[PDB]
């Protein structure tokens with residue numbers, strides 16, 4: 395396509411279906427998710443957003459990222475901190491898991507942010523835009539399966555408080571992505587990096603499924 399935002403969505407549709415088809419996500423969508431499983435997703439997201447937001451901050455003034463720098467609207471670390479205190483309790487920093495598949499994702503995020511910052515947008519796309527389109531329904535499934543007490547915490551990750559409308563913010567984000575100027579080579583690399591991002595998630599999903607089924 396012309397617009398990078400369209401080119402990304404089109405080019406990742408297949409891997410996106412793979413992610414939807416992953417065994418752990420299938421169980422999820424079918425409402426079969428356990429607290430143990432959900433804890434692992436929350437832990438994974440924490441390590442992922444820590445590293446991504448670290449690298450966004452390192453690159454916030456770079457011409458290859460600045461147009462999609464939206465820290466107040468999108469930042470997820472503090473929400474995940476809140477959520478992990480609930481899921482893992484007061485000592486969550488000492489007890490949350492940090493698995494090999496989580497590390498592999500984090501390592502690629504840091505590699506991209508430090509040495510290939512022009513691809514960071516692929517990672518921010520894969521995560522943030524995903525989160526905006528999807529939080530709604532998967533959250534509801536979670537609440538049903540998990541049957542939380544009404545303790546007012548645990549799911550802050552799924553609310554972006556600084557975005558009034560996800561639809562309008564997603565159009566704005568697409569617009570800014572489409573304003574990035576890149577050579578055809580960089581653009582091919584950005585697309586490929588998004589596929590890589592999806593694969594990192596899929597591999598993580600494969601690992602969590604393994605860890606939970608012994």
Ligand code: HEM
Pocket residue numbers: 399402403410413414419423519520521523524525527528592595596
């Ligand atoms: C690894 C997990 C996933 C990632 C990284 C991911 C990522 C994304 C991304 C980046 C988008 C934005 C597409 C665009 O507008 O350009 C998106 C949209 C979407 N995702 Fe996901 N997703 C994942 C899992 C799922 C699952 C499990 C479902 C449903 C069960 C789902 C349903 C959707 C839907 C319905 C859209 C919106 C389609 C549209 O408006 O055009 N995704 N996802």
Ligand SMILES: CC(C)Cc1c(-c2ccccc2)ncn1CCCn1ccnc1
Pocket residue numbers: 422435436438439523524525526527528529532595598
């Ligand atoms: C339950 C949910 C958080 C699963 C998920 C992950 C995930 C990744 C890595 C580890 C754990 C979970 N990434 C995206 N999702 C779907 C929610 C966002 N979305 C995207 C498109 N439609 C919705």
